[PDB]
Design a protein around this ligand. Structure first.
Ligand code: MET
Ligand SMILES: [Co+2]
Ligand SMILES: [Co+2]
Ligand SMILES: [K+]
Length: 304
């Protein structure tokens, strides 16, 4: 395998961490290949759940806990800390909140969160590599509580970063917030990518095509599929009670991705950097509720 950049995985990984049986587990947690039968039973449907009020309450709670856990991770970002160390803390913080770390054994993913450094677009696997000054690192947190998933990520700076990094990260965050601002009953899901690419392209960056935002509630990944690039063919119109993520991945160079031999880590083909932000959003009668927002501080961690 020919690496596309300077990043390498750092093995061995620690044995997978167990989750106490008193925490409720998603279906895939105990499937030998991590398959989610509940997801597969809806494969290829474009029909979108309209959430009940109980469902809404379950999403508010899990998404709020998910944010608390991301914040724990943000507090640990510094040169010298390994991504495994961050994952171990995430793992414990999930459990302290009586939640299952949704990534754990999802299609056999080995860890409890994704840590994506520099050229890693998404789904990097926490490992023995210490963060280095000048790195940018995304932590993606997904929690499962009382039958609901909640999902968010942010890109963080490690010590001081270059101007390229700041611009990349700032623009990615703007892309996300500009898409969120357009969310309300009656908007086509396909529109969000027109907004995202327009801003990304205006800043010289590209938009990853192989990974999309998604519905999330009782299932971790479900309808709608939500592309972040322009003139996509996404099916559906937003309605009050829809819940889904927006999670744009933007790249300094080209948009093309490939996957490491590990089956997960997605990297730019050109080895240039990529950044990402994500929220889970509830479409209301008039706009949208950002379920995974910070409740206590105005800005994302990188601006603080
Ligand atoms: C290894 S599963 C990680 C999934 C990620 N949290 C997402 O938003 O799709
Ligand atoms: Co996510
Ligand atoms: Co997501
Ligand atoms: K990255």
């Amino acid at each position: 395998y020919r690496y596309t950049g300077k990043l390498r995985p750092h093995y061995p990984l620690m044995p997978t961490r167990p989750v106490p049986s008193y925490i409720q587990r998603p279906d895939y947690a105990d499937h030998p290949l991590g398959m989610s039968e509940s997801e597969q039973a809806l494969k290829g449907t474009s029909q979108i759940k309209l959430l009940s009020s109980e469902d809404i309450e379950g999403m508010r709670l899990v998404c709020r806990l998910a944010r608390e856990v991301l914040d724990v991770a943000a507090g640990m970002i510094k040169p010298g800390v390994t991504t495994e160390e961050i994952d171990h803390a995430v793992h414990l913080a999930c459990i302290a909140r009586n939640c299952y770390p949704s990534p754990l054994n999802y299609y056999n993913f080995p860890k409890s969160c994704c840590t994506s450094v520099n050229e890693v677009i998404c789904h990097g696997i926490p490992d023995r590599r210490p963060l280095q000054e000048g790195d940018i690192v995304n932590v993606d947190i997904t929690l499962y509580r009382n039958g609901y998933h909640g999902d968010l990520n942010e890109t963080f700076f490690v010590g001081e970063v270059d101007d390229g990094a700041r611009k990349l990260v700032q623009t990615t965050y703007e892309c996300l917030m500009q898409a969120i601002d357009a969310v309300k009953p009656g908007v086509r899901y396909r529109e969000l990518g027109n907004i995202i690419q327009k801003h990304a392209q205006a800043n010289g960056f590209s938009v990853v095509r192989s990974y999309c935002g998604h519905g999330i509630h009782k299932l971790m990944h479900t309808a709608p599929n939500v592309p972040h690039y322009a003139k996509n063919k996404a099916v559906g119109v937003m309605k009050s009670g829809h819940v889904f993520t927006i999670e744009p991945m933007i790249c300094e160079g080209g948009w093309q991705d490939e996957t490491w031999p590990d089956g997960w880590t997605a990297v730019t083909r050109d080895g240039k950097r990529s950044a990402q932000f994500e929220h889970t959003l509830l479409v209301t009668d008039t706009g949208c509720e950002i379920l995974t927002r910070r409740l206590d501080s105005a800005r994302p961690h990188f601006m603080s």
